[PDB]
């Protein structure tokens, strides 16, 4: 699963 | 009309630190984290770290963890990032960056201009 | 450490003609959860900063001409340039932004032959 927090500025959402 | 304005090149010595600093404009500065990525002459980008402008947390790569310091000033709107014992690797062109900024309303991706560091005595 | 790695090194192709730049990640970087790619394309002329061309793979970013395509998923991506021009020439960089620390191909020179 991906690390959110690897690039705060990337929102997961679609 | 977003921008990220770096201070400029550098000689420092091998062993010795340096500061590269990156004024941002153009956004609220508390929203985002700037990214520092540096590149060798001719070889890949290396993502160093991150500092969000408003919060302070830090991410640090685990490969510079021993000697980077990121830092911000909110007033200033300003990002620094620190290398100490500068080995010869560290020869390379310092960038802050917007990286891939993807919010539920936009997604761009800006850079700073760089700023080249030569470790050399 | 997820191992970026790009095919080939350095590319020659001619103008008009499809340029194609494959990566392969060392990991899966699509979430099922929301069946996106944490890959990104990035364009980097001499002495610039590099610019972003594609995010989630394959979504384009605003500004690039359709020629510019982004296919694959998974660990086996492409950029493939449909109809190369002068402006393109570059060299080309995957990305990933999946897990810490974010890591970059070792990038692929688009050079332009007669």
């Known amino acids: 699963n991906p690390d959110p927090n690897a690039n705060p500025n990337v929102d997961p959402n679609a | 009309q977003v921008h990220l304005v770096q201070s400029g090149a550098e000689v420092k010595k091998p062993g010795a630190s340096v500061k590269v600093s990156c004024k941002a404009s153009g956004y609220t500065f508390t929203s985002y984290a700037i990214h520092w990525v540096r590149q060798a002459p001719g070889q890949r980008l290396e993502w160093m770290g991150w500092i969000k402008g408003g919060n302070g947390n830090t991410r640090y790569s685990q490969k510079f963890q021993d000697r980077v310091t990121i830092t911000r000033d909110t007033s200033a709107s300003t990002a620094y990032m620190e290398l100490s014992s500068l080995r010869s690797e560290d020869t390379a062109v310092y960038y802050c960056a917007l990286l891939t900024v993807i919010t539920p309303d936009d997604a761009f991706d800006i850079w700073g201009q760089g700023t080249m560091v030569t470790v050399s005595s | 450490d997820i191992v970026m790695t790009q095919s080939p090194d350095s590319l020659a192709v001619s103008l008009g003609e499809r340029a194609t730049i494959n990566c392969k990640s060392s990991q899966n970087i699509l979430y099922s959860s929301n069946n996106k790619n944490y890959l990104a394309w990035y364009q980097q002329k001499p002495g610039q900063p590099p610019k972003l061309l594609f995010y989630?793979?394959?979504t384009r970013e605003s500004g690039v001409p359709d020629r510019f395509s982004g296919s694959g998923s998974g660990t086996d991506f492409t950029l493939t340039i449909s109809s190369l021009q002068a402006e393109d020439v570059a060299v080309y960089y995957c990305?990933?932004?999946?897990?810490?620390?974010?890591?970059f191909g070792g990038g692929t020179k688009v050079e332009i032959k007669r």
């Open positions: 989630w793979a394959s």
């Open positions: 990305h990933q932004y999946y897990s810490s620390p974010l890591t």
